[PDB]
C-alpha cells in the first residue's frame, strides 16, 4: 500500500544502474566516456575493497600475511581495466613498510586466485600494491631532516598612489597658476 522505497527507487535507478545486456570493452582481459562505465567501475572498486579486505585480515592468503593484518587505504581499478592499484595503509615505520610491501606483492597472484575461486569476482585482472606518494614524501622529509645538520648552536597600502595623485593635483595647480521568407517572390513569379 505505502512503500518507503518507492520514493527513491527511480532516482537510484539512473545513478546506480544501467539497462541492457552489454558489458564494457574494458572489462575484458584484453574512447568515448560512458555513464555505464562509471557504474561498472564503481561497483568493482567496492567489491574488490570488500573482497580484498576478506583476504588480508583472513587466513586464506598465508600465515605471515594473516599476521600482517593489512588494512587498506583504498582500491582503484584502471579505466582500461588492464590492472588494479590496491593502495594499502602505511605505518610510520619506513623499514617495516618496505618489508610489508614485498610480502604483499609476492602473494598478489594467490590473492587474486582466492577471489576468483570463491566466485565473488569472476574475471579479476592483475593486482598491484602501492604506497601513497603523500605518505612516502612525508617520511622522506623526516629522514632527511634528521640527517640534516643545523650548524653550530603607505600609498600602496590604501591602494591609491597618494604621491602620484598629489603630483597630478600639484601639476594641475601649476597650470592653474522575417519578411523576405514569405511567399511573395514565389507567388509573383520572380524565379
Amino acid at each position: 500500500s505505502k512503500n518507503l522505497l518507492k520514493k527513491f527507487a527511480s532516482k537510484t535507478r539512473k545513478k546506480f544502474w544501467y539497462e541492457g545486456p552489454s558489458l564494457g570493452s574494458h572489462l575484458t582481459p584484453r574512447k568515448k566516456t560512458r555513464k555505464e562505465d562509471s557504474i561498472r567501475l564503481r561497483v568493482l572498486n567496492g567489491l574488490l575493497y570488500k573482497s580484498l579486505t576478506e583476504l588480508l585480515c583472513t587466513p586464506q592468503v598465508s600465515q605471515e600475511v594473516y599476521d600482517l593484518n593489512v588494512e587498506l587505504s583504498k582500491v582503484s581499478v584502471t579505466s582500461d581495466f588492464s590492472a588494479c592499484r590496491v593502495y594499502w595503509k602505511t605505518g610510520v615505520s619506513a623499514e617495516q613498510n618496505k618489508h610489508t610491501e614485498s610480502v604483499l606483492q609476492r602473494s598478489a597472484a594467490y590473492m587474486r586466485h582466492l577471489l576468483i575461486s570463491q566466485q565473488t569476482l569472476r574475471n579479476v585482472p592483475p593486482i598491484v600494491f602501492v604506497q601513497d606518494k603523500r605518505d612516502l614524501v612525508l617520511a622522506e622529509v623526516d629522514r632527511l631532516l634528521a640527517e640534516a645538520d643545523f650548524g653550530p648552536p603607505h600609498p600602496n597600502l590604501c591602494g591609491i598612489d597618494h604621491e602620484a595623485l598629489n603630483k597630478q593635483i600639484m601639476e594641475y595647480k601649476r597650470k592653474k597658476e522575417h519578411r523576405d521568407a514569405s511567399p511573395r517572390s514565389f507567388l509573383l513569379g520572380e524565379e
Binding site: 603523500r134 614524501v137 612525508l138 622522506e140 622529509v141 632527511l144 631532516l145 640527517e147 640534516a148 645538520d149 643545523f150 650548524g151 653550530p152
Partner: protein, 208 residues
C-alpha cells in the same frame, strides 16, 4: 632540436671501448650491438676523452659564463685552481712535518669536497595557499642538491666581495673556507636546513 628523437647521446669513455669483450656486462654488451644500427649525436665541442676533464668543474665554469664568454670563464676557473694550489703550497712549506701531512694541495680535490660541504639535503618550494605564500619543506633530488651548491658559491663571490678583489681571489678563498666548513656558503646551507625544521609541519600542502 635538429636531432631527431632517434639519436643517441655519444659515449666518450676511452677505456670502455677498449675493454676486453668478456669484461663487459651483457647489458652493456647488448647496448653496443644495438647502437651499431642507430644514429649517434655528434660530440660537443667541449666533450673530449681528456684525462683532465672533470664534469663537475666544467659545469661550474658554464654557470659563471656571461654572454657566451667561455674563454673568460675558463680563464677565471684556471686562475682559481692555481690560486688554491699556490695558497696551499705556501701553507705546506711554512708548516711542520706533522702539519704537512694533513695539508691538501690538490685543487681538484679541494673543489669537489668543498661543493659537497655546501649541498643541502632539503630545500623549500614557495606555495600560495588561500592567498598566502608558504614555503614547504621538500626533499631535494641529486640534481637540485648539486645545482644549489654551485649557485650559492657563484653568487657569494659575484656580489659579496670588495670592489677591487677579483673572482680568482674570492672564489679561491671561498672554496678553501667551504673545504673547512667555515664559509658563508656553508652558512646559507645551515639556514636553509634550520628553516625546514621551522616549517616541518607544513609539508602536507605538497601536491606534486
Amino acid at each position: 632540436s635538429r636531432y631527431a628523437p632517434e639519436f643517441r647521446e655519444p659515449l666518450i669513455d676511452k677505456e670502455y671501448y677498449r675493454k676486453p669483450v668478456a669484461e663487459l656486462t651483457e647489458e652493456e654488451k647488448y647496448d653496443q650491438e644495438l647502437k651499431k644500427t642507430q644514429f649517434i649525436k655528434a660530440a660537443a665541442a667541449t666533450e673530449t676523452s681528456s684525462v683532465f676533464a672533470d664534469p663537475v668543474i666544467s659545469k661550474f665554469t658554464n654557470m659563471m659564463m656571461k654572454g657566451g664568454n667561455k674563454v673568460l670563464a675558463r680563464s677565471l676557473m684556471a686562475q682559481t685552481l692555481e690560486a688554491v694550489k699556490r695558497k696551499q703550497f705556501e701553507k705546506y712549506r711554512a708548516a711542520s712535518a706533522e702539519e704537512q701531512a694533513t695539508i691538501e694541495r690538490n685543487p681538484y680535490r679541494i673543489f669537489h669536497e668543498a661543493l659537497k660541504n655546501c649541498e643541502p639535503v632539503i630545500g623549500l618550494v614557495p606555495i600560495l595557499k588561500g592567498g598566502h605564500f608558504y614555503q614547504v619543506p621538500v626533499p631535494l633530488a641529486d640534481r637540485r642538491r648539486r645545482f644549489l651548491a654551485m649557485k650559492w658559491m657563484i653568487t657569494e663571490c659575484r656580489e659579496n666581495k670588495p670592489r677591487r678583489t677579483l673572482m680568482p681571489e674570492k672564489l679561491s678563498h671561498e672554496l678553501l673556507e667551504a673545504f673547512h666548513n667555515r664559509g658563508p656558503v656553508i652558512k646559507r646551507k645551515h639556514n636553509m636546513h634550520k628553516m625546514a625544521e621551522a616549517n616541518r609541519a607544513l609539508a602536507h600542502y605538497r601536491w606534486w
